[PDB]
Design a protein around this ligand. Structure first.
Ligand SMILES: Nc1ncnc2c1ncn2[C@@H]1O[C@H](COP(=O)(O)OP(=O)(O)O)[C@@H](O)[C@H]1O
Ligand SMILES: [Mg+2]
Length: 240
């Protein structure tokens, strides 16, 4: 579950969205620090200690803090853990929501730490991950700071606006329908994103076929628990 900083960011941002955050803020350093802040419902003080599953596995491999203020409470609570060992808790003043800081990832596993990829490779994986969450959560604001610079800022918007902000280009929206397809295509620019029932799909069979029938292609597929309709979809661009 936890091999590198991107895996940490994934689990934390998933937890923020699970807690119906509308603003998710991520900061990474070098790794050295992963911080995820959200304005979701928070965690009751009586449950903060319990959560140390994904947070257990993260806290046992880092110098870990989690602070959270429950929507019903005036104060937050903070728990601090090192490599799975609880170091203490504290009352803290904070806004409603949750902030998790993961420091010195794999400090307790120096071989695993020395085999991590260079900072710039880890950075790009976290950048791509946050783009992927932003593409399926257009109602959510996302910010990413890396090495102290605000490298990604996406405000709440329509899906088409959110696609266009992410990829910095104008798109044409295509549609074809128990099976539903919605794509956004931009032709000059090649990148082929696929979301099946709101989840990111990396399948090679699908990206090659999007390459073959289209270019930037962002495909949102909704299916009950195909490639024909995609090529049917590819013919639906307006004449000009
Ligand atoms: N950002 C957050 N906001 C609210 N609750 C959180 C947050 N992060 C974690 N939690 C709480 O901690 C629990 C454990 O998180 P986790 O270890 O990721 O397991 P899981 O999310 O699969 O239940 C969650 O069920 C949720 O109750
Ligand atoms: Mg979780």
């Amino acid at each position: 579950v936890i091999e590198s900083p991107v895996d940490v960011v994934k689990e934390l941002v998933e937890n923020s969205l699970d807690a119906k955050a509308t603003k998710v803020e991520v900061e990474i350093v070098k790794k050295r620090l992963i911080r995820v802040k959200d304005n979701g419902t928070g965690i009751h003080p009586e449950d903060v200690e319990k959560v140390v599953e994904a947070l257990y596995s993260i806290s046992s491999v880092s110098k870990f803090k989690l602070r959270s203020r429950f929507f019903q409470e005036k104060e937050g609570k903070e728990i601090e853990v090192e490599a799975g060992n609880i170091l203490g808790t504290r009352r803290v003043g904070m806004p409603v929501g949750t902030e998790v800081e993961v420091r010195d990832l794999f400090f307790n596993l120096p071989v695993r730490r020395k085999f991590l990829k260079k900072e710039d490779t880890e950075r790009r994986k976290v950048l791509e991950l946050i783009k992927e969450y932003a593409l399926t959560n257009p109602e959510v604001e996302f910010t990413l700071f890396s090495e102290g610079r605000e490298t990604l800022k996406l405000k709440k918007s329509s899906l088409k606006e959110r696609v266009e902000e992410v990829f910095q280009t104008k798109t044409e929206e295509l549609y074809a329908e128990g099976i539903t397809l919605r794509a956004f295509v931009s032709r000059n620019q090649g990148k082929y994103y696929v979301f099946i029932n709101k989840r990111p799909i990396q399948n090679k069979n699908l990206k090659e076929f999007l390459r073959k029938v289209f270019t930037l292609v962002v495909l949102y597929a909704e299916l009950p628990p195909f490639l024909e309709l995609v090529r049917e979809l590819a013919g639906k661009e307006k004449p000009i």
